[PDB]
Write an enzyme that holds these catalytic residues in place. Sequence first.
Site, short mmCIF file in Angstrom:
data_model
loop_
_atom_site.label_atom_id
_atom_site.label_comp_id
_atom_site.label_asym_id
_atom_site.label_seq_id
_atom_site.Cartn_x
_atom_site.Cartn_y
_atom_site.Cartn_z
N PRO A 169 167.99 -14.43 22.75
CA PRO A 169 166.54 -14.13 22.73
C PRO A 169 165.70 -15.19 23.43
CG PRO A 169 167.45 -13.49 20.66
CD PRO A 169 168.53 -14.31 21.38
N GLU A 170 164.84 -14.74 24.33
CA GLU A 170 163.99 -15.65 25.07
C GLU A 170 162.53 -15.46 24.66
OE1 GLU A 170 165.16 -15.62 29.32
OE2 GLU A 170 167.26 -15.72 28.66
N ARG A 221 173.73 -22.50 30.79
CA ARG A 221 175.03 -21.96 31.18
C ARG A 221 175.03 -21.50 32.64
NH1 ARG A 221 175.46 -15.65 28.90
NH2 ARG A 221 177.02 -15.60 30.57
#
Length: 282
Positions: A1-2, A270
Amino acid sequence: PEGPEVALTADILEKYFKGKTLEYIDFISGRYSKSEPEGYDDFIANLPLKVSNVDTKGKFLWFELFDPNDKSNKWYIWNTFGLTGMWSLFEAKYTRAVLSFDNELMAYFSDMRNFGTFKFSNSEKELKRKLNELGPDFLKNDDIDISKIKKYKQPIVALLMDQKKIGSGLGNYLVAEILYRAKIDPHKLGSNLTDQEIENLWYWIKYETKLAYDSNHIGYMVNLENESSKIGRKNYHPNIHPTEKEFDFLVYRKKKDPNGNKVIADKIIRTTYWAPAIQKLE
């Protein structure tokens, strides 16, 4: 979730819990079932508390509660979803925290990977200190000054992933998606962007954050998809009007971009997803 999802979750959280009284909070599993979060004991000791707000800044969400009696006794629940944390109104798989309100009203927080964090605080100056650790909200702030990206001699990726340098809220898929629209190679340094690219970037940032926020769900948050489709949406960035009705990943976790072009699962500071065929250092 951003950023976008956290803000929409806060919206839903206020909708059902604002004004309600938090009776009990229980960590039945995960990273906290062993040893509860910072300030937990001092917290359930001041309960019950009324929820007065559920707000966010970037990817940081917090509950604001006040003692019914002594309204100067304000409490806060700091919270970050992490990679898999999601809130819900029904007990879902991997539920980690269980919140009990008056009239048997429940609220849950699931988190398969256990990257989410909790922390209870009784200081308002400590909140301001925290919120000051974040750059302006890329979704709620319709007038950030993206121009200062030039002053930095570092990768545009890092500059957007950072939560303080330019603004807060962007994460793995937003940055990847945004850069793909601006057609900018993630490796491009902020000091090499042209006033053109800059105002172009400020465009897709707004566009993507608004589209994300306006989406029923993104992938996660699917646990709130019924509440999400039943709640309106605040007019953040009121002039940019995304065309698609739902947010679709064009490059994020996509082997090939729309038109077929290959998408590299690069891994710089990542994994950042981009299509060299469309994103240029120019």
